[PDB]
XYZ file of C-alpha atoms in Angstrom:
765
model
C -96.673 119.757 111.852
C -93.202 118.717 110.644
C -94.581 116.899 107.579
C -94.786 117.680 103.864
C -98.048 116.041 102.772
C -98.959 115.419 99.126
C -101.641 113.470 97.291
C -100.020 112.403 93.992
C -96.701 111.250 92.586
C -94.104 113.819 91.550
C -94.638 114.948 87.959
C -91.108 116.348 87.717
C -87.933 116.900 89.724
C -89.188 120.048 91.391
C -91.935 117.960 93.009
C -89.758 115.130 94.349
C -88.739 114.930 98.019
C -85.046 115.284 98.992
C -83.333 112.894 101.386
C -79.665 112.717 102.261
C -76.900 112.171 104.804
C -74.404 114.815 103.705
C -72.524 112.533 101.343
C -75.248 110.521 99.527
C -78.366 112.195 98.219
C -81.649 111.171 96.633
C -84.852 112.643 95.229
C -87.934 110.512 95.943
C -90.670 110.802 93.294
C -93.390 108.796 95.023
C -94.439 107.107 91.801
C -97.046 104.316 91.921
C -95.857 101.689 89.464
C -92.615 103.091 87.957
C -90.635 104.571 90.856
C -87.480 106.649 90.179
C -84.968 107.900 92.710
C -82.327 110.306 91.388
C -78.982 109.366 92.912
C -76.197 111.768 93.915
C -72.804 111.320 95.516
C -71.298 114.618 96.616
C -67.778 113.947 95.315
C -68.904 112.883 91.818
C -67.750 115.899 89.786
C -66.519 116.168 86.212
C -63.023 117.124 85.123
C -59.631 116.799 86.759
C -56.990 119.099 88.266
C -56.043 121.836 85.775
C -54.082 125.100 85.641
C -56.512 128.009 86.085
C -54.209 130.776 87.357
C -53.177 133.574 84.988
C -49.411 134.203 84.800
C -49.636 137.194 82.466
C -52.342 138.901 84.564
C -49.711 140.233 87.015
C -48.267 142.675 84.458
C -51.740 144.236 83.987
C -52.221 145.003 87.705
C -50.360 148.350 87.929
C -52.008 149.371 84.647
C -55.501 148.705 86.047
C -54.562 150.601 89.183
C -53.342 153.366 86.880
C -56.551 153.457 84.810
C -58.612 153.833 87.986
C -56.466 156.534 89.570
C -56.687 158.520 86.333
C -60.494 158.060 86.543
C -60.383 156.354 83.139
C -62.986 153.765 84.134
C -63.454 152.410 80.610
C -59.782 151.454 80.371
C -60.093 149.834 83.816
C -62.778 147.420 82.604
C -61.208 146.592 79.254
C -58.014 145.688 81.139
C -60.012 143.622 83.658
C -60.845 141.427 80.641
C -57.214 140.279 80.756
C -56.878 139.177 84.412
C -59.451 136.407 84.272
C -59.399 132.613 84.172
C -61.683 129.679 83.216
C -65.044 128.292 84.229
C -65.595 125.652 86.885
C -66.394 121.979 86.364
C -69.940 120.691 86.772
C -71.588 118.619 89.492
C -72.741 115.308 88.090
C -75.739 113.076 88.714
C -74.778 109.524 89.695
C -77.877 108.051 88.029
C -81.358 106.767 88.729
C -82.700 103.913 90.826
C -85.831 102.539 89.192
C -88.410 100.418 90.970
C -91.119 98.964 88.670
C -93.866 97.728 90.985
C -95.633 94.932 89.086
C -99.173 95.293 90.354
C -102.121 95.460 87.972
C -105.088 97.558 89.069
C -106.368 100.957 90.130
C -104.678 102.779 92.963
C -106.722 104.768 95.486
C -106.226 106.430 98.878
C -102.795 107.736 97.880
C -100.673 110.024 100.029
C -97.000 110.991 100.070
C -95.242 112.661 103.002
C -91.812 113.946 104.043
C -91.017 113.758 107.764
C -88.391 116.407 108.500
C -88.474 115.450 112.188
C -87.355 111.899 111.485
C -85.591 112.468 108.145
C -87.684 109.740 106.502
C -89.929 109.957 103.422
C -93.043 107.780 103.120
C -95.345 106.829 100.238
C -98.649 105.057 100.744
C -101.268 103.706 98.349
C -104.014 101.082 98.266
C -104.269 98.818 95.203
C -107.087 96.241 94.975
C -107.801 96.237 98.701
C -104.164 95.476 99.602
C -102.551 98.460 101.355
C -98.956 99.205 100.449
C -96.323 101.303 102.223
C -92.806 102.544 101.365
C -90.062 104.128 103.508
C -87.054 106.160 102.326
C -84.091 107.585 104.211
C -80.344 107.936 103.898
C -78.395 106.908 106.982
C -75.376 109.041 107.921
C -73.699 106.586 110.343
C -74.166 103.709 107.879
C -73.451 105.789 104.770
C -76.238 104.303 102.646
C -79.799 104.868 101.504
C -82.420 102.424 102.867
C -85.853 101.545 101.428
C -88.461 99.186 102.842
C -91.489 98.060 100.817
C -94.265 96.631 102.990
C -97.751 95.304 102.215
C -100.857 94.631 104.291
C -100.930 91.036 103.083
C -98.090 88.598 102.367
C -96.745 87.804 98.920
C -97.789 91.159 97.467
C -94.404 92.768 96.792
C -93.316 92.002 93.223
C -91.201 94.344 91.123
C -88.058 94.833 89.006
C -84.843 96.699 89.830
C -82.344 98.564 87.632
C -79.843 101.405 87.813
C -79.085 103.578 84.755
C -76.921 106.714 84.693
C -76.421 109.588 82.225
C -72.615 109.349 82.697
C -70.440 106.471 81.509
C -71.783 103.443 83.345
C -72.190 99.692 83.389
C -74.986 97.800 85.063
C -74.928 94.167 86.164
C -75.959 91.951 89.073
C -73.728 89.967 91.415
C -74.458 87.925 94.542
C -77.490 89.599 96.088
C -76.895 93.131 94.773
C -77.185 95.310 91.709
C -73.939 96.984 90.610
C -73.674 100.253 88.634
C -70.242 101.729 88.159
C -68.920 104.313 85.737
C -66.951 107.463 85.008
C -67.471 111.225 85.177
C -66.790 113.372 82.093
C -63.169 114.417 81.735
C -64.556 117.900 80.966
C -68.031 119.351 80.923
C -68.736 122.763 79.442
C -71.078 124.886 81.519
C -74.836 124.913 80.759
C -74.664 128.215 78.857
C -71.764 127.451 76.500
C -73.060 126.254 73.120
C -70.106 124.502 71.466
C -69.485 121.473 69.265
C -68.888 119.025 72.155
C -70.124 120.022 75.612
C -69.269 116.736 77.390
C -65.864 115.050 76.975
C -64.578 111.554 77.926
C -60.834 111.767 77.240
C -59.030 108.420 77.630
C -55.600 109.762 78.549
C -56.778 112.077 81.384
C -59.941 110.426 82.661
C -62.479 111.702 85.203
C -63.607 110.542 88.631
C -65.058 107.036 88.482
C -67.859 105.971 90.799
C -68.935 102.625 92.291
C -72.570 102.082 93.273
C -74.196 98.983 94.718
C -77.856 98.330 95.656
C -78.255 95.400 98.074
C -81.633 93.679 97.461
C -82.832 91.901 100.578
C -86.338 90.448 100.153
C -88.101 88.317 102.707
C -90.341 85.556 101.380
C -90.756 84.113 97.904
C -87.817 83.964 95.506
C -85.745 86.536 93.683
C -83.316 86.085 90.733
C -81.092 88.168 88.456
C -83.014 89.729 85.552
C -81.069 91.545 82.769
C -78.918 94.320 84.351
C -80.667 94.286 87.741
C -82.700 91.759 89.672
C -86.364 90.748 89.874
C -88.432 90.002 92.952
C -91.750 88.115 92.799
C -94.305 87.446 95.535
C -92.342 88.487 98.624
C -93.677 89.379 102.061
C -91.525 92.541 102.244
C -88.598 93.999 100.392
C -85.645 95.916 101.859
C -83.128 97.788 99.716
C -79.805 99.364 100.766
C -77.761 101.563 98.426
C -74.275 102.970 99.005
C -71.980 104.645 96.498
C -68.464 106.106 96.436
C -65.952 107.606 94.041
C -62.217 107.334 93.487
C -61.750 111.017 94.406
C -58.457 111.229 96.343
C -58.401 115.007 96.758
C -58.322 118.196 94.723
C -54.589 117.793 94.050
C -54.796 114.224 92.786
C -55.562 113.252 89.205
C -58.369 110.641 89.046
C -56.238 108.392 86.847
C -53.518 108.530 89.524
C -55.878 107.823 92.407
C -55.038 105.097 94.916
C -58.696 104.688 95.985
C -60.703 101.727 94.756
C -64.366 102.772 95.162
C -65.457 99.135 95.057
C -63.476 98.545 98.255
C -64.822 101.735 99.867
C -68.418 100.733 99.261
C -67.989 97.058 100.249
C -66.285 98.039 103.491
C -69.253 100.280 104.127
C -71.480 97.221 103.749
C -69.291 95.020 105.958
C -69.828 97.365 108.872
C -73.593 97.043 108.326
C -73.339 93.262 108.346
C -76.767 91.699 107.896
C -79.571 94.000 106.776
C -81.874 94.954 109.649
C -84.225 97.776 108.631
C -85.565 98.536 112.093
C -81.955 98.683 113.274
C -80.714 100.879 110.412
C -83.770 103.135 110.842
C -83.199 103.325 114.617
C -79.569 104.255 113.948
C -80.429 106.823 111.287
C -83.125 108.769 113.154
C -81.145 108.836 116.391
C -78.127 110.315 114.586
C -80.464 112.869 112.957
C -82.531 113.877 115.998
C -79.374 114.765 117.975
C -78.974 117.665 115.496
C -82.552 118.487 114.535
C -84.028 118.465 118.072
C -81.672 121.230 119.235
C -84.126 123.887 118.057
C -87.897 123.820 118.411
C -90.222 126.386 116.767
C -93.960 126.877 117.233
C -95.572 130.024 115.782
C -99.081 128.855 116.697
C -101.638 126.594 115.015
C -102.690 122.595 109.140
C -104.219 119.529 107.443
C -104.093 120.423 103.721
C -101.496 119.420 101.161
C -98.133 121.213 101.208
C -98.491 122.456 97.623
C -101.829 123.923 98.692
C -100.370 125.570 101.815
C -97.896 127.528 99.671
C -100.778 128.751 97.503
C -102.805 129.577 100.642
C -100.131 131.791 102.296
C -101.137 134.728 100.108
C -104.495 134.683 101.936
C -104.031 132.666 105.149
C -100.434 133.709 105.959
C -100.219 130.499 108.068
C -97.752 131.108 110.883
C -97.241 127.346 110.958
C -96.122 127.347 107.280
C -93.338 129.850 107.940
C -92.473 127.709 110.984
C -92.434 124.550 108.842
C -89.972 125.928 106.294
C -87.819 127.213 109.151
C -87.154 123.650 110.277
C -86.974 122.573 106.632
C -83.926 124.825 106.199
C -82.269 123.164 109.209
C -83.153 119.776 107.708
C -81.577 120.523 104.338
C -78.246 121.669 105.803
C -77.977 118.586 108.004
C -78.805 116.230 105.127
C -76.242 117.958 102.813
C -73.317 118.980 105.047
C -71.807 116.907 107.849
C -68.407 116.715 109.554
C -65.929 114.854 107.391
C -67.952 115.480 104.241
C -67.949 118.244 101.639
C -70.019 121.420 102.166
C -73.267 122.226 100.364
C -73.024 123.530 96.786
C -75.716 125.622 95.060
C -78.034 122.591 95.194
C -76.804 121.017 98.432
C -75.868 117.527 97.314
C -78.878 116.949 95.035
C -78.411 117.504 91.318
C -79.956 115.519 88.419
C -78.211 117.390 85.589
C -74.983 116.723 83.704
C -74.616 120.479 83.124
C -76.333 122.091 86.109
C -77.378 125.751 86.258
C -74.195 127.624 87.198
C -72.459 124.221 87.349
C -73.780 123.727 90.906
C -70.532 125.300 92.080
C -69.539 127.044 95.323
C -70.119 130.725 94.522
C -68.476 132.742 97.285
C -69.966 136.227 96.829
C -73.311 134.521 97.539
C -74.648 130.982 98.030
C -71.568 129.603 99.823
C -72.645 131.732 102.765
C -76.367 131.970 103.510
C -76.033 128.193 103.842
C -74.202 128.284 107.173
C -75.684 131.409 108.762
C -78.265 129.037 110.263
C -75.495 126.814 111.651
C -74.661 129.637 114.062
C -77.978 130.663 115.583
C -79.745 127.290 115.264
C -76.878 125.329 116.890
C -75.641 123.149 114.022
C -71.840 123.430 114.322
C -71.283 119.950 112.896
C -72.438 120.955 109.411
C -70.235 124.049 109.535
C -67.145 121.945 110.219
C -67.435 120.676 106.654
C -67.095 124.265 105.509
C -64.042 124.992 107.702
C -62.273 121.909 106.375
C -63.301 123.117 102.941
C -61.941 126.647 103.467
C -58.705 125.081 104.765
C -58.114 123.117 101.565
C -58.406 126.319 99.500
C -55.044 127.585 100.802
C -52.741 125.294 98.736
C -54.650 126.471 95.648
C -55.242 130.005 96.946
C -51.588 130.782 97.751
C -50.709 129.709 94.218
C -53.378 132.009 92.797
C -52.404 134.906 95.080
C -48.732 134.823 94.085
C -49.251 134.069 90.370
C -51.996 136.503 89.441
C -51.050 139.330 91.826
C -47.678 138.510 93.371
C -49.252 138.972 96.814
C -48.703 136.773 99.859
C -51.285 134.688 101.743
C -54.168 132.969 100.010
C -57.391 134.094 98.293
C -60.408 132.730 96.443
C -62.734 134.184 93.840
C -66.511 133.623 93.705
C -66.906 130.415 91.687
C -64.947 127.410 92.969
C -65.483 123.675 92.231
C -64.397 120.377 93.773
C -60.884 120.939 92.388
C -60.667 124.110 94.499
C -60.418 126.716 91.755
C -59.390 129.950 93.475
C -59.019 131.699 90.063
C -61.514 133.838 88.172
C -64.345 132.296 86.139
C -63.891 132.370 82.379
C -63.861 135.314 79.977
C -67.049 137.203 80.979
C -68.040 140.627 82.268
C -65.572 141.713 84.980
C -68.491 142.456 87.348
C -68.869 138.672 87.698
C -65.377 137.149 87.580
C -63.281 139.504 89.738
C -63.602 139.140 93.489
C -60.398 138.158 95.349
C -62.037 138.996 98.670
C -64.445 136.048 98.372
C -62.076 134.022 100.522
C -62.084 136.931 103.019
C -65.845 136.491 103.514
C -65.318 132.757 103.938
C -63.044 133.627 106.849
C -65.979 135.294 108.650
C -67.461 131.844 109.209
C -64.235 130.807 110.908
C -64.454 133.417 113.656
C -68.236 133.146 114.070
C -67.798 129.386 114.574
C -65.880 130.264 117.763
C -68.067 133.137 118.941
C -71.158 130.920 118.926
C -69.760 127.540 119.859
C -66.606 128.248 121.900
C -63.950 126.028 120.298
C -60.877 127.641 121.780
C -58.436 124.832 120.967
C -59.933 124.510 117.475
C -59.611 128.267 117.048
C -55.927 127.954 117.958
C -54.789 125.045 115.782
C -57.149 125.348 112.789
C -59.301 128.488 112.636
C -56.798 131.298 113.303
C -54.024 129.876 111.042
C -56.439 130.181 108.087
C -57.694 133.588 109.180
C -54.128 134.827 109.503
C -52.965 134.096 105.959
C -56.058 135.645 104.417
C -55.224 138.798 106.339
C -51.688 138.656 104.988
C -52.990 138.897 101.440
C -55.192 141.859 102.377
C -52.035 143.651 103.499
C -50.599 143.242 100.018
C -53.992 143.947 98.389
C -54.509 147.249 100.197
C -52.718 150.263 98.683
C -52.571 154.011 99.417
C -54.387 156.758 97.499
C -53.612 160.468 97.214
C -55.612 161.053 100.414
C -53.511 158.433 102.221
C -56.460 156.061 102.714
C -56.164 152.274 102.458
C -58.056 151.210 99.272
C -58.441 148.195 97.031
C -57.758 148.387 93.307
C -59.235 146.817 91.268
C -62.412 146.748 93.355
C -65.986 145.871 92.406
C -69.196 145.758 94.349
C -70.406 142.234 93.528
C -72.122 142.002 90.114
C -73.113 145.697 89.985
C -72.044 148.345 87.496
C -71.845 152.089 87.981
C -71.436 153.487 84.464
C -72.022 152.451 80.863
C -70.279 152.707 77.478
C -72.743 150.701 75.431
C -72.563 147.018 76.306
C -69.730 147.967 78.672
C -71.188 147.454 82.178
C -68.335 149.316 83.875
C -67.532 147.662 87.197
C -63.848 148.287 88.059
C -63.681 150.903 90.775
C -61.745 151.797 93.911
C -62.316 150.874 97.568
C -65.906 149.737 97.134
C -67.961 149.553 100.307
C -68.126 145.751 99.917
C -64.324 145.355 100.036
C -63.887 147.834 102.888
C -66.385 145.949 105.067
C -64.803 142.510 104.553
C -61.210 143.590 105.174
C -62.401 145.519 108.235
C -64.393 142.456 109.368
C -61.440 140.100 108.795
C -58.946 142.445 110.475
C -61.245 143.040 113.435
C -61.903 139.317 113.885
C -58.191 138.509 113.682
C -57.285 141.096 116.340
C -59.885 139.625 118.757
C -58.610 136.149 117.791
C -55.043 137.135 118.795
C -56.318 138.706 122.020
C -57.989 135.410 122.944
C -55.047 133.251 121.879
C -52.537 135.761 123.360
C -50.117 136.001 120.425
C -49.163 138.052 117.340
C -48.812 141.405 119.089
C -47.014 143.024 116.166
C -49.339 141.494 113.567
C -52.529 142.717 115.251
C -51.066 146.223 115.631
C -50.256 146.210 111.920
C -53.841 145.232 111.221
C -55.220 147.809 113.646
C -53.207 150.543 111.933
C -54.525 149.455 108.522
C -58.051 149.397 110.002
C -57.631 153.025 111.095
C -57.220 154.319 107.534
C -59.737 152.463 105.329
C -61.731 154.502 102.832
C -64.430 156.263 104.839
C -68.178 155.694 104.858
C -70.136 158.177 102.788
C -73.897 158.935 102.846
C -75.195 159.591 99.349
C -77.216 162.503 98.156
C -80.411 160.435 98.578
C -79.425 159.553 102.137
C -78.374 156.012 101.164
C -75.238 154.116 102.060
C -72.840 154.622 99.153
C -72.164 151.353 97.340
C -68.967 152.652 95.736
C -66.305 155.192 96.765
C -68.365 157.899 95.066
C -72.009 158.885 94.955
C -72.954 156.674 92.003
C -76.115 155.092 93.435
C -79.198 155.517 91.229
C -82.752 155.432 92.638
C -84.142 153.173 89.877
C -81.304 150.625 90.242
C -83.294 147.413 90.591
C -80.165 145.216 90.840
C -80.265 142.121 93.018
C -76.905 142.307 94.803
C -77.012 144.906 97.574
C -73.384 144.173 98.512
C -72.628 147.201 100.654
C -75.436 145.899 102.924
C -73.075 143.094 103.941
C -72.506 144.993 107.171
C -76.197 144.815 108.113
C -77.250 141.179 108.122
C -73.968 139.252 107.602
C -71.894 141.214 110.041
C -72.137 143.641 112.944
C -71.032 147.047 111.571
C -74.301 148.775 110.554
C -76.066 148.762 113.940
C -77.852 151.575 115.833
C -75.295 151.548 118.700
C -72.111 151.064 116.608
C -72.778 153.050 113.409
C -76.094 154.910 113.453
C -75.188 156.786 110.277
C -74.609 153.669 108.239
C -77.564 151.982 109.857
C -80.070 154.656 108.850
C -78.353 154.961 105.464
C -78.673 151.205 105.006
C -82.469 151.460 105.253
C -82.513 154.112 102.539
C -80.299 151.921 100.356
C -82.626 148.943 100.742
C -85.733 150.974 99.863
C -84.023 152.354 96.772
C -83.211 148.819 95.572
C -86.727 147.450 96.227
C -88.631 150.019 94.146
C -85.709 142.107 93.022
C -87.577 138.910 93.900
C -84.815 136.341 93.378
C -84.996 133.331 95.675
C -81.937 134.411 97.654
C -82.910 138.095 97.358
C -86.244 137.811 99.178
C -84.802 135.530 101.828
C -81.916 137.964 102.491
C -84.325 140.900 102.718
C -85.915 139.040 105.630
C -82.701 139.335 107.650
C -81.941 142.837 106.365
C -85.305 144.178 107.614
C -84.957 142.241 110.882
C -81.691 144.129 111.527
C -83.390 147.409 110.622
C -85.993 146.612 113.307
C -88.879 146.822 110.806
C -91.396 144.055 111.416
C -93.949 145.178 108.791
C -91.424 145.061 105.964
C -90.538 141.537 106.991
C -94.285 140.927 106.858
C -94.268 141.722 103.127
C -91.152 139.610 102.476
C -92.866 136.441 103.723
C -95.670 137.043 101.218
C -93.176 137.418 98.385
C -91.188 134.308 99.369
C -94.314 132.148 99.609
C -95.443 132.706 96.021
C -96.324 129.298 94.636
C -93.844 128.521 91.855
C -95.438 126.156 89.266
C -92.906 123.460 88.391
C -91.294 123.590 84.985
C -90.412 127.252 85.662
C -86.670 126.637 85.218
C -85.527 130.027 83.867
C -85.066 133.530 85.241
C -87.925 135.042 83.222
C -90.283 132.379 84.668
C -90.928 133.908 88.119
C -91.553 131.959 91.291
C -90.666 131.832 94.936
C -91.296 128.307 96.253
C -91.752 125.058 94.359
C -94.376 122.517 95.439
C -91.785 120.648 97.563
C -91.003 123.827 99.611
C -87.647 124.159 97.849
C -86.528 127.677 96.905
C -87.340 128.462 93.317
C -85.617 131.473 91.822
C -85.207 130.390 88.239
C -83.782 126.943 89.312
C -83.790 125.026 92.588
C -81.283 126.912 94.738
C -80.578 125.637 98.287
C -79.258 129.084 99.216
C -82.772 130.458 99.690
C -83.831 127.431 101.707
C -80.956 127.822 104.158
C -80.985 131.611 104.341
C -84.695 131.694 105.132
C -83.870 130.143 108.548
C -81.155 132.775 108.984
C -83.534 135.676 108.352
C -86.367 134.306 110.495
C -84.137 133.739 113.517
C -83.082 137.427 113.438
C -86.741 138.459 113.795
C -86.793 136.924 117.285
C -83.166 137.045 118.574
C -80.170 139.239 117.821
C -76.783 139.292 119.515
C -74.540 141.340 117.184
C -74.791 144.700 118.936
C -73.475 143.724 122.396
C -76.832 142.655 123.858
C -79.150 139.657 123.455
C -82.054 141.453 121.769
C -85.298 139.550 122.563
C -87.860 139.766 119.757
C -86.784 142.936 117.924
C -88.871 142.440 114.772
C -91.744 140.169 115.771
C -94.292 140.243 112.900
C -97.843 141.489 113.520
C -99.476 138.154 112.614
C -97.492 136.139 115.222
C -99.116 137.182 118.506
C -98.307 133.837 120.165
C -95.336 131.535 119.838
C -92.676 129.443 121.622
C -89.209 128.903 120.201
C -86.433 127.050 122.052
C -82.834 126.087 121.501
C -81.516 129.213 119.759
C -77.924 130.332 120.060
C -76.430 133.815 120.487
C -72.947 135.247 120.554
C -71.135 133.689 123.519
C -72.695 130.234 123.464
C -75.887 131.272 125.223
C -78.928 129.081 124.560
C -82.110 131.190 124.394
C -85.718 130.104 124.765
C -88.531 132.590 124.056
C -92.290 132.292 124.561
C -94.543 135.235 123.607
C -98.310 135.501 123.751
C -100.521 138.227 122.219
C -97.590 140.121 120.795
C -95.877 140.478 124.203
C -92.926 138.505 125.572
C -94.185 136.130 128.241
C -90.980 134.463 129.398
C -87.386 133.972 128.242
C -84.585 131.690 129.440
C -80.859 132.399 128.925
C -78.827 129.235 129.376
C -75.103 129.549 130.177
C -72.580 129.515 127.338
C -68.823 130.073 127.158
C -68.774 133.786 128.035
C -69.464 135.001 131.544
C -71.260 138.332 131.382
C -74.564 138.611 129.547
C -76.829 141.587 128.834
C -80.432 141.294 127.596
C -82.630 143.837 125.911
C -86.366 143.722 125.066
C -88.177 146.903 123.960
C -87.066 149.694 126.333
C -85.761 147.467 129.138
C -82.224 146.219 129.747
C -81.205 143.414 132.124
C -77.621 142.702 133.200
C -76.163 139.475 134.660
C -72.592 139.695 135.947
C -72.320 135.888 135.802
C -74.459 132.881 134.890
C -73.882 129.418 136.312
C -77.536 128.324 135.847
C -80.221 129.181 133.271
C -81.745 132.512 134.267
C -85.309 133.585 133.526
C -86.654 136.844 132.104
C -90.328 137.727 132.460
C -92.632 140.558 131.394
């Protein structure tokens, strides 16, 4: 059942239902008589282009490299406090769309549902015998949200309409529409900074202004203009259409210098719609959505309760249909938040109701910028990933300037936290374990090569993908230096957000050739060499990368048998940290595999056990894919119990523990779309793997899924895989052709080989 069923209105934001089209978002509350829909436009950010690079940080680079080579790790960190930058800008809420249904009486027979198969939300109630019905969806081809209010009997739809926003805004009616337009703060301090003014509206340098317009189209009765909005009385049915836009002209354009008039952008959007036909807009919306969502079908076996009750019931029932429902829900959230031509998905997709979000709803690139597009590889959603490639491309103008100012190196880079203005610089004056990671852009390049391995865009690899991959490798050449042992190392180098020593409140993090850095540069260099082999160019450049790849700092197995996180045996068995970075090679990558690197594969299992005695929303969901790559199906069994802990709403802080809110959203401390989209990535690796040179059929099938049929999956080479198992044994599998000729399959202790596929082949027990 692809439906999220509830029996009351949302009591808070973590109970609303998300709908979107990748540019316009909305949270439907399902209220009875005072409806609220939180409105979001993806480009509505605070601030304006600034200068975030650090000129005087270049002079401290040889000194940091000197403090590390002398093994004076304290001096390394206290110098890292001088190569930093400033925090990002915040993601803003566009406002609220209120709908005050003016019916007087008791409501019964209520139900609220979210159809992730049709990308439409519904709310139903019965007041005084008259049955009422509401529909919500955001059309991607028509770039607007649509709502229809229907009643069982005519003349029963009467309400009031208004739009208020927490930003600067005006509200007034005109023609047959409600107009709300306003500004975004010229600067917004992050949620943790406690200063005199946290939200600024500077007249000289203004922020991004937005234009919103709700077209009210009732049928029957009369409707006039009441106060800021409009009022409808005694209508047969009401249809609303809402589209919004901003004057954002690019990361390198000041909003006060913009040549975009958002009123014109929104009105032209409404001209293409013409007259308002709901059953035409709905037929256009669902068709555009099903072409992406119908590519993958999952069925883990047989279901009538409420969704908030199913999450509570997983700790006893362990419903294989609930884990199958969230699997499609992850695919649904990425489609409705990232589309070609649009921006990618930030820490909360496109949905954010807060002026000062948690972590400014930024694009953190050590985590949560990835784990959102891992599903776009296996579950065949390349369209959403194209928004990330266009996004990575726009980092180079700002990343080259950061690479040459802060370090004097060539190419481009990007640190963890980046905002709409494409900040490739560090994040504020904080602990260096957080705000120093130049190789964040190197990880982003992994999605460039994987987009070709899975989908087969050879021309797009030539003109767009490889040119970005090539410059990021150029910086790595100037970032890698030699040690006494003649190895290629990185300095400064930190395993993301983890410290190895202490000097009080000094969480020492600056080290040399950490396993995290050595896996990314090896992954970027390897993927660039294979890119040049395909495109038949850069013979001298690849050989330069291959020579550098032959002398990286070696893998080391710690005294406990674990994979060493740093260049030395500094791993501690009671380290309950949340970032197992050196395990990048296992799930996001192909290095720690039984056939390629058995030493680092067995040592990765011991690392994971040490770090799990750790229940963060993205932590549990990642451990699903980690254990799937370690071929342990009973450890993935326990991870699904941890992820399906019912998180009571209002738990909006790290101390308040939870795993899944009532609306199936990932919980962590706050809503975090990363766990929603990485859950799909970890579940798919339980049933299909293609990183180790063979299409592994069902390597980590859980014990409680004896039956199941999944179709439409994608493996390395463009192969479409369909798998049906019954009673814990593979019944039949189909390998559709892709873009690579030879294919090799592997299930349990059996290996099949096909020298060529021109027609979907079958694989039976």
